[PDB]
C-alpha cells in the first residue's frame, strides 16, 4: 500500500488467424478478412441487368430468324446468355467473320427490325426450303428473302435505300452457293451469279461457288452471310444478277453497355451487379477467383484462391 503496480497491454484471442507480410510468410493476428471471392451461388440474378435467355437459340440464329427463334424478334438485353445446347434448324449457312457479327450485335443490345419496301422487279420472292420447315410447311429465315427466277429470266437487280435516319442501319444479307449447275440455273437462269452491296464509302462483291458440301437437313448447298452498315446520310445499293439472298429491312444499331456471355447457369429473381458464366457473385471484395469472364460491377480476377488482410494487431495468447 506504499506502492502500486500499473500495467499496460493489449487484447488477444484463443483462436486467431495467420496472414503474410513483407517480413513473415506467416504471423498470428486477432482478426482477418478474405479479399478473394471464390464461390458462386450458381444462378444468374435477373437484376439490375436485363438478362435474355437464348435457350435453344444462338444470337445469330435469333438475328437471322431461324423459325424456332421467332419468339426473340424485336427483343433486347443488357446481357445475352447463349446456351451450350442450342442448335440451328434452317438452311445451312456460314458467316465469314461470324465472331465479329456476333460481337457487334451483342453490343447493340437489340434485335429491333424495321421492314423496308424493297422493290424486287422481275423475280420471285419468299423462296422456302425443305431444310427450314414451319411445322409441315417449307420456310426460311424470317429476316431474309430468297429471290428466285420468274418466267425463264432473272434480270439484273439494281435497287437502293437511303438512310434518312439519325442512327446506323445494320443490313444483313447473303449469297447462295448451289451444289450442282442444275440448281444454279433451275433457280437463277444465269450461269454464275454475283452480288454487290455498296455504300458511298465501301463495297463488297461476292461470286458464288458451285460444288458439293457435306449434306445438312437434306441440303448440300450453303448460304454465306454478310452485313452492311449504313450511316445516316449514306445510301445502300444492292446490285446482282443471281444468287442474292436479300434483306427485308434493317436492324437498329445502339450504343451502350450491352454484351453476351456463354453459360448454362439458370436465371433467378434476385439482385446482383456482378455476373459470371458460373453464375452471379457478390462484389464486396476487391478480388475474385471464379472466372476471368465477367459482366457488370465485379471484383478483379486473380489467380489466388485466398488472400487474408489483417483487420487487427498481432496475437500472443
Amino acid at each position: 500500500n506504499n506502492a502500486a503496480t500499473l500495467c499496460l497491454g493489449h487484447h488477444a484471442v484463443p483462436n486467431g488467424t495467420m496472414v503474410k507480410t513483407i517480413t513473415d510468410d506467416q504471423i498470428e493476428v486477432t482478426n482477418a478478412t478474405e479479399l478473394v471471392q471464390n464461390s458462386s451461388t450458381g444462378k444468374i440474378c435477373n437484376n439490375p441487368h436485363k438478362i435474355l435467355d437464348g435457350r435453344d437459340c444462338t444470337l445469330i440464329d435469333a438475328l437471322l430468324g431461324d423459325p424456332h427463334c421467332d419468339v426473340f424478334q424485336n427483343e433486347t438485353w443488357d446481357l445475352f446468355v447463349e446456351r451450350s445446347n442450342a442448335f440451328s434448324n434452317c438452311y445451312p449457312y456460314d458467316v465469314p467473320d461470324y465472331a465479329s457479327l456476333r460481337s457487334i450485335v451483342a453490343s447493340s443490345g437489340t434485335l429491333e427490325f424495321i421492314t423496308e419496301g424493297f422493290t424486287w422487279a422481275g423475280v420471285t420472292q419468299n423462296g422456302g426450303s425443305g431444310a427450314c420447315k414451319r411445322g409441315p410447311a417449307n420456310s426460311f429465315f424470317s429476316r431474309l428473302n430468297w429471290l428466285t427466277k420468274s418466267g425463264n429470266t432473272y434480270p439484273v437487280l439494281n435497287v437502293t435505300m437511303p438512310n434518312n435516319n439519325n442512327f446506323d442501319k445494320l443490313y444483313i444479307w447473303g449469297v447462295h452457293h448451289p451444289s450442282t449447275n442444275q440448281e444454279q440455273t433451275s433457280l437463277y437462269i444465269q450461269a454464275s451469279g454475283r452480288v454487290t452491296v455498296s455504300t458511298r464509302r465501301s463495297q463488297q462483291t461476292i461470286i458464288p461457288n458451285i460444288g458439293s458440301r457435306p449434306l445438312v437437313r437434306g441440303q448440300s448447298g450453303r448460304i454465306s452471310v454478310y452485313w452492311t452498315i449504313v450511316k445516316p446520310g449514306d445510301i445502300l445499293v444492292i446490285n446482282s444478277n443471281g444468287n442474292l439472298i436479300a434483306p427485308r429491312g434493317y436492324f437498329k444499331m445502339h450504343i451502350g453497355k450491352s454484351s453476351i456471355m456463354r453459360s448454362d447457369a439458370p436465371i433467378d429473381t434476385c439482385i446482383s451487379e456482378c455476373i459470371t458464366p458460373n453464375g452471379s457473385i457478390p462484389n464486396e471484395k476487391p478480388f475474385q477467383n471464379v472466372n476471368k469472364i465477367t459482366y457488370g460491377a465485379c471484383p478483379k480476377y486473380v489467380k489466388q484462391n485466398t488472400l487474408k488482410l489483417a483487420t487487427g494487431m498481432r496475437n500472443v495468447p
Binding site: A3, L8, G9, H11, I22, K303, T311
Partner: protein, 172 residues
C-alpha cells in the same frame, strides 16, 4: 514489430479485455482491476478502416469486352487475345499479392506504434514518481487508490502532489 512493444518487451495479451484494444491492469492497496483505453483503441480502428479502399476504386464496372475462351483453333489473332488476358491476369495477381503484404506489414507496425505511444504518454505523466520495470508495468512508489489510477488513465494526473513521498519510498 518495428518498435518492439507488442510481442516485444510485453510478453502477452489479455484474453479477457472484451472492452478495448489497449488499457490498464492496476494492483494497489484496495486490490486490482482492468479498464479499456478508448483514445488509442480508436486511433487503430480509424487507421485500419480508412486503409482498405484508400487505394482501390469504387469497383470498376465493365461491360462488353473480348472473348476469353474458344471452341476452334485459329492462330495469330486468338494467340493475341489469349496473351492479352494472360498478361493482365498476372499483373493483377501480382498487384494484389503486393497490396496485402504491404498493408499487413503496415497494420502490424501501426499497432506496435499505438502500444508504445501509450507507454510513453504514460511514462511521461508519472515523470519521476515511478520506474519502468521493463515488462510494460511501472512500479508506482506511493499510495495510489481507485481515483489516483483513474486520474492517470484520464490523463489529468498531477505528479507534484505525490512528488516528495514518491522520491521517499524510492531512494528514502
Amino acid at each position: 514489430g518495428l518498435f518492439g512493444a507488442i510481442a516485444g518487451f510485453i510478453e502477452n495479451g489479455w484474453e479477457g479485455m472484451v472492452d478495448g484494444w489497449y488499457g490498464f491492469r492496476h494492483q494497489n492497496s484496495e486490490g486490482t482491476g482492468q479498464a479499456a483505453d478508448l483514445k488509442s483503441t480508436q486511433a487503430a480502428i480509424d487507421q485500419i478502416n480508412g486503409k482498405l479502399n484508400r487505394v482501390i476504386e469504387k469497383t470498376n464496372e465493365k461491360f462488353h469486352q473480348i472473348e476469353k475462351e474458344f471452341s476452334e483453333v485459329e492462330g495469330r489473332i486468338q494467340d493475341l487475345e489469349r496473351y492479352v488476358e494472360d498478361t493482365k491476369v498476372d499483373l493483377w495477381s501480382y498487384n494484389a499479392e503486393l497490396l496485402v503484404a504491404l498493408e499487413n506489414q503496415n497494420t502490424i507496425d501501426l499497432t506496435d506504434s499505438e502500444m508504445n505511444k501509450l507507454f510513453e504518454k504514460t511514462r511521461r505523466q508519472l515523470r519521476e514518481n515511478a520506474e519502468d520495470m521493463g515488462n510494460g508495468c511501472f512500479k508506482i512508489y506511493h499510495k495510489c487508490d481507485n481515483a489516483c489510477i483513474e486520474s492517470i488513465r484520464n490523463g489529468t494526473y498531477d505528479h507534484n502532489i505525490y512528488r516528495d513521498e514518491a522520491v521517499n519510498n524510492r531512494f528514502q
